[PDB]
Amino acid sequence: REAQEAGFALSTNGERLELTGPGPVPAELSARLEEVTLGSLAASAELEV
């Protein structure tokens, strides 16, 4: 919802994923994307523990 509000489509291909849209992604939402994917990985780790 925070990405599509900027007109960017969140393309997913697994736990890692990118964005599809016009022009390069600004820093804030790209940071959010890589933040949430790192958080998902570490969250699976803490899930297993």
């Binding site: 820093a27 933040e35 790192l38």
Partner: protein, 49 residues
């Protein structure tokens, strides 16, 4: 013994360092860095073009 427990906490601080690298501020800084380097790359490439 106090030194031992303190150094045990410091050793456990590896997870704190890892979770610092998923935080908003550090990741925003990293994305700004890579974005400025990238845009330098595209400006050089378009000058060549």
């Amino acid at each position: 013994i106090h030194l031992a427990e303190a150094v045990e906490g410091l050793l456990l601080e590896v997870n704190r360092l890892d979770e610092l690298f998923r935080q908003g501020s550090f990741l925003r800084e990293k994305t700004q860095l890579e974005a400025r380097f990238k845009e330098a790359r595209e400006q050089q490439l378009e000058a060549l073009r």
